[PDB]
Each structure stands twice: as C-alpha cells, then as structure tokens.
Amino acid sequence: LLSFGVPRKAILYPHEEPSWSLAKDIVFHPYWMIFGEVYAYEIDVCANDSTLPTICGPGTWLTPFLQAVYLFVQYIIMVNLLIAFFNNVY
C-alpha cells in the first residue's frame, strides 16, 4: 500500500508544503482500492472524462501503470493467498 501511495502522491502533487494531510493522502485511496473501488475517472488525469483536469502535468502518465501493478499484487496474489491461508488452516 505504501509502495504505491507515496509515488502516486509525489507525482500528482509536487508543489506541496509539509502538512499532516500528506500522511492521509498516501494511505487513504490505496486502502479503499482493496474494497472494490477503482477511482476510474481519476486514473489518467489528462483524459477528457477526467475529474482532475487541474492535476494533469509532467509525469502523470506513470500513475496508471503504477496502479495496474498495485492491484495485480493486492488481489491476484495477496487476497487469494489469504483465502488460501484460511482454507488450509480452517
């Protein structure tokens, strides 16, 4: 989760000062991704259907690649390993 959250925030929000909101932003949306949410119209902030058009900038085309890797790891590896854990220890 943190491996994803910290780059996502740093790439999309560079002009930020220190604040405790940084601690929420690196942890909040990545957690909710585990639970069926995708933030579809926040991926690819430079698209025409985007809800974050003010956030388009240099290097933002990276964040869809990052999130694709993130959810591959959490669901296809880690959620199913956890299912497999319980099935074999029940």
Ligand X SMILES: C[C@@H]1CC[C@@]2(OC1)O[C@H]1C[C@H]3[C@@H]4CC=C5C[C@@H](OCCC(CO)CO)CC[C@]5(C)[C@H]4CC[C@]3(C)[C@H]1[C@@H]2C
Interacting residues toward ligand POV by CB under 6 A:
1-2, 19-21, 23-24, 27-28, 31, 44, 46-48, 56-59, 61, 64-65, 68-69
Residues 16-55 that bind ligand X (CB under 6 A): 18-20, 22-23
Which among ligand X, a second copy, Ca ion, none contacts residue 13 (Cβ within 5 to 8 A by kind)?
none
The torsion defined by the Cα of 5, 43, 31 and 12, in degrees rounded to 10, comes to 30
Angle at 87 between CA 86 and CA 90, to 5 degrees: 70
- Tokens (6 digits) for 87: 């099935």
Binding site for a second copy (CB under 8 A): 28, 31-33, 35-40, 43-44, 64, 68, 71, 75-76, 80-88, 90
